[PDB]
């Protein structure tokens, strides 16, 4: 077996119906081998290349791309569906690179894998189409994950009171958020998403959690107190622990929380003297002037003995930050998406070992 798959051109629409349009992300076969639909489609591309059949390669690629776009339009509100197709679009792109026969993409190949390179067609124009599509599919995933998290954020990060996580004497909780992040991470891993892509997804969703949290704090009257600063610092420390548990500290995710971290620190720091003001100006390098001024204006005294922050103290901070080219924006842009990349991730999977389970309904294709 050479690691190719043959099909009759008459069956191309049934191929993509069964492998893409109607394929269930929870099926046993594709969970035993993550990326299986991408490997099978690539093995089909190999045989059309072997035949030197331009029109068959063109038809298969168009049918494949159109079918992935159709699934994501119809069911693209579903996290598992979007994760699954993002993962498989990426793996299909990696296969087209790894088996292109271009020297730069072959550095991690076995001898046998090099024997599986395409021999008749340069598919660089389709690789570029797939890369461009992957950017948009990732944006779709980010918005689906945001919509799921959004109702939990303020309740769990701000409204739910704890004492270092424990109910105090004195709806969604911090634990709700962490369990939901757990679910997102589990599903991406089950789908074989690239580790470098999972890192980006996690950085983006930490950015969203921090930005929704800080904007909500800036827009209400009751979240700027010593007590709430303590709570926010605890909650962020558990988000950092989640990263450590997942071995994701190098994702950049913790750094995206710096504006919320600094706002919470402003709730704790001394707020009286000119040295206190200088310290705030050096500390708050991830908050705009308007954000610093808002938190200090909102700050609630810890008891009846404490005065509100004085207006002259706030003015001192405003005056000493004038040199900033500071954006007068009060709110973080919670819709920002960090530009995503898909670094080449070759696979050790040996194509000649791939079996086609009966459960996919692909009996009409043949191993070559």
């Amino acid at each position: 077996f050479q690691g190719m798959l043959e099909y009759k051109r008459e069956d191309e629409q049934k191929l993509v119906k069964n492998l893409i349009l109607e394929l269930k992300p929870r099926g046993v076969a594709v969970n035993l081998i993550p990326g299986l639909p991408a490997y099978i489609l690539f093995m089909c591309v190999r045989h059309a290349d072997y035949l030197n059949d331009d029109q068959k390669v063109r038809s298969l690629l168009t049918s494949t791309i159109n079918s992935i776009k159709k699934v994501l339009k119809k069911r693209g509100d579903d996290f598992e569906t979007v994760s699954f197709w993002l993962s498989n679009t990426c793996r299909f792109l990696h296969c087209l690179k790894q088996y292109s026969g271009e020297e730069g993409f072959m550095k991690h190949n076995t001898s046998r894998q090099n024997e599986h390179c395409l021999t008749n067609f340069d598919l660089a124009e389709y690789r570029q189409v797939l890369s461009d599509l992957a950017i948009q599919i990732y944006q779709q995933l980010v918005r689906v994950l945001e919509n799921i998290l959004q109702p939990m954020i303020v309740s769990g990060m701000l409204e739910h009171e704890t004492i270092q996580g424990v109910s105090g004497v004195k709806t969604y909780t911090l634990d709700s958020i962490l369990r939901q992040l757990n679910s997102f991470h589990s599903v991406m891993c089950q789908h074989g998403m690239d580790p470098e892509l999972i890192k980006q997804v996690v950085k983006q969703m930490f950015y969203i959690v921090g930005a929704i949290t800080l904007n909500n704090l800036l827009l209400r009257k009751d979240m700027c107190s010593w007590s709430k600063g303590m709570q926010i610092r605890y909650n962020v420390s558990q988000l950092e622990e989640w990263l450590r548990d997942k071995n994701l500290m190098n994702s950049g995710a913790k750094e995206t929380l710096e504006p919320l971290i600094q706002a919470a620190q402003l709730l704790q720091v001394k707020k009286k003297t000119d040295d206190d003001a200088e310290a705030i100006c050096s500390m708050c390098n991830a908050l705009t002037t308007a954000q610093i001024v808002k938190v200090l204006n909102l700050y609630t005294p810890v008891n009846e003995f404490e005065e509100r922050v004085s207006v002259s103290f706030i003015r001192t901070i405003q005056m000493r930050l004038r040199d900033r080219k500071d954006s007068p924006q009060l709110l973080m842009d919670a819709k920002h998406i960090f530009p995503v990349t898909f670094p080449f991730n070759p696979s050790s999977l040996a194509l000649e070992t791939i079996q086609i389970p009966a459960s996919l309904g692909l009996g009409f294709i043949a191993r070559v």
């Binding site: 776009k69 994501l72 026969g101 020297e103 008749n120 067609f121 598919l123 124009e125």
Partner: peptide, 23 residues
């Protein structure tokens, strides 16, 4: 490594294929 044929897309075909939302 053989010389391979680059499969060329037209610009309208490329635009349609690479637009996620056209479907």
């Amino acid at each position: 490594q053989p010389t391979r044929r680059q499969i060329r897309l037209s610009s309208p075909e490329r635009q349609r294929l690479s637009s996620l939302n056209l479907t």
